[model samples]
Target: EVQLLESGGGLVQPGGSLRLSCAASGFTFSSYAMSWVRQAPGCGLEWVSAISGSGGSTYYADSVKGRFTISRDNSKNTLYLQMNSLRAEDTAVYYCAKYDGIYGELDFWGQGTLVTVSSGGGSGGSGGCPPCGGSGGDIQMTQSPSSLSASVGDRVTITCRASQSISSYLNWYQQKPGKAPKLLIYAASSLQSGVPSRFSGSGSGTDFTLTISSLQPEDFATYYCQQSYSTPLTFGCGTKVEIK
Candidate 1:
């Protein structure tokens, strides 16, 4: 039942500044950590920044470290983002996410507000999550059947195989057109709150499965499996499930 309503996004002149807010409701804001995720058009996702549940500790992507800021107001249950010195390359769909330590990772996402830096003067290309590798080696995620077709009420299952053991760090996401990815399952098999029961995840270590027990009209979006155990965070190739 957690909802992260986002506001403050739209066209901004190149080199101009923009600020956004995520008004969280349905839960105590400071009780859990939160993050800001970004995705450029037709590209992979990028982690912008993360603020710990304590509201003290914070992490930022190297690319945005100097130009982007993430903060929150527990008293108001609202999180904020302001990226200065923007450029055309800075354009992306920005989302506010909630990190659930119980299930692990950012398990809830906002609808995603789009930021388009109008052309004229801009700089810098996109960058992804830095390598925060653990003691163990890193892992890669490869999802099968890059594309598939299914009908409503049909049982559809997608598989994601990791290059190495990822423990229970695999999470499944559902992304529709022009919207941010939504957390369906986290920590391998743990379903997130507000997600329908029909969507289930199973498996451990290196292999995982996301099953749609009975697909609905809205189940035809692309699905991704992301690894959270180690650094150099990565998502699966993503399975596109289309209506048959």
Candidate 2:
């Protein structure tokens, strides 16, 4: 089957560090670049950055520059992302992603990995308090959950309930442009070649993954589960940068 393979998996204790992987298969590895995205429990999507393995070039989302880094091994046909200084809120599914279309919409994704951040592990509690809606600047998308203390490695599923069912046409976009948007999973997680395979995507009929498998400091991007079955692509309003 067409898959965006990833390496690195483990039970993360509280306050500990986690490392995830993004690997690809079934297509030419050079056509597209790989990008990293993160969704903290309930939040929108953020365009972290992209690594063009072709010419060793890289592109990072404005807010995530310096904080994130990308590298690749042509011999192994894989791309890797590394972020530092992670916390409890960092515990979320991080997806290795790929994009397509001249507009840079997500056309493919990987079966994201869920990482948990805890206190005993090392550090915890989303690292620091939630910012005052920096950059995107306070555009509440979904409702807030009662308990906000997110744990490390919990299976939490956020939904973008649609007024109408977005069949296979349901295309999920990251965030909108100039607004911290990025495509993590699209067309049901098909890693748009030319992009990274680690950023694999999957799911149909609404349920989807913008998984990271492992959490990292740099994986701090807003994630939106959306439907792009056809036109007027709709998203789950975006889960804000909040604690689970």
Candidate 3:
């Protein structure tokens, strides 16, 4: 089991420096690489930087390259991000994510910590909107039935179809009201840690399905399918499962 927690100040003045830390526990720290991701109040996710788990390497997103530094403290089992020359547009929620190289998707994420930058001649952040053809045309995701009715002990299946072959870049999440979404499955059909064995994912390429071997009372929530293999992450409209 792996868990991540983020800690940092809530406010930063424009042109000032900011530092965020992601602390990891319950696993071998030097075996997994970590990356930083930011999401503006109403904007899409932006990749910031990543540091190799074993050290000696780092990568920054094109936009944030040279503007931010991604570093690690292997002895302490922690990853860090330090940003300089900040702007008000930099105000966003920052998350520390564990990159799954085999799956090619971020499998573990820390609860995001909000960072706000004061206005100082900087532009506002961009919202997360569907882009036209940034990477391999517009990838569309759709769910069938939209809603489902099932009883206890009954098998349930939800399908999410994508316009292109996203391979194992697909992931599934469970969303409930007033709480952050929970990752249930990733890299196509692999169940996440702590997730029940009954909640399974299957399929590949563009077509995929999340199957519940036996429906439970707590399984009645909206399920969304997201693709991570492409730029500008896209999410399916979602399928809602209900009690019959």
Q: Each prediction's Cα lDDT score?
A: 0.80, 0.50, 0.76
Candidate 3 has an lDDT of: 0.76
What TM-score goes with each of the models? 0.80, 0.50, 0.69
Q: Regarding TM-score, does 2 or 3 come out ahead?
A: 3
Candidate 1 CA-lDDT value = 0.80
Report the C-alpha lDDT of model 3 over 1-244, residue by residue, as the tens digit: 6789999958778778988998999888888878786766644344567777787888765556688898989899999998988767677788888877666467777888988887544444432332211223447777676788888889998998888898878888786643345689998888888899999988888899999999888888878787777544566766878888
Off by over 4 Å in 3: 42-46, 120-164, 175-181, 211-244
Candidate 2 deviant stretches above 4 angstroms:
9-17, 61-64, 120-124, 127-236, 239-244
RMSD in angstroms, candidate 3?
4.7
RMSD of 2: 12.5
For model 2, how does the per-residue alpha-carbon lDDT over 55-146 read when each residue is reduced to its tens digit?
37876544445655667666677877665555465565566766553334555667666666654644445554333222342222231231
Q: What's the number of clashes in each of the models?
A: 0, 57, 0
Measured by TM-score, how close is model 2 to the native structure? 0.50
Give the winner by TM-score: 1
- When superposed on Cα atoms, how far off is each prediction in RMSD? 4.1, 12.5, 4.7
lDDT of 2 at 103: 38
> Which ten contiguous residues of candidate 1 have the minimum total lDDT?
127-136
